[PDB]
Design a protein around this ligand. Structure first.
Ligand code: NA
Length: 130
């Protein structure tokens, strides 16, 4: 499914994302927008390392979830990558939280660094009443 902007903001807020590890809800929104366009079914296969990025947050199969086909895989979220392709994003949110508890935090996502970090992201939550 493709979440509508405010629908996702409210969902992430309900799931405890606002301020998680100091990450504002607007930053999570910016991350989701640039990673997947708010699409829970998005997948990006990287033929080089043979890993695939899954779901709304584009979490990678080499370090975070198991897709049973990625070389050098550690499954830090102890979770099937299939759980990251569900309309229900609770599993994805729990894994996203695990990712950001590592030293880099949300900087783990290159797209977020390039399109969101240090920039005004207030437009992502404006009018959502969150
Ligand atoms: Na893995």
């Amino acid at each position: 499914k493709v979440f509508e902007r405010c629908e996702l903001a409210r969902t992430l807020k309900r799931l405890g994302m606002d301020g998680y590890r100091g990450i504002s809800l607007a930053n999570w929104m910016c991350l989701a927008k640039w990673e997947s366009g708010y699409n829970t079914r998005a997948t990006n296969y990287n033929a080089g390392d043979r890993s695939t990025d899954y779901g709304i947050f584009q979490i990678n199969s080499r370090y975070w979830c198991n897709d049973a086909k990625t070389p050098g895989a550690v499954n830090a979220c102890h979770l099937s990558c299939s759980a990251l392709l569900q309309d229900n994003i609770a599993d994805a949110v729990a894994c996203a939280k695990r990712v950001v508890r590592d030293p880099q935090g949300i900087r783990a996502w290159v797209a977020w660094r390039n399109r969101c970090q240090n920039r005004d992201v207030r437009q992502y939550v404006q009018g959502c009443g969150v």
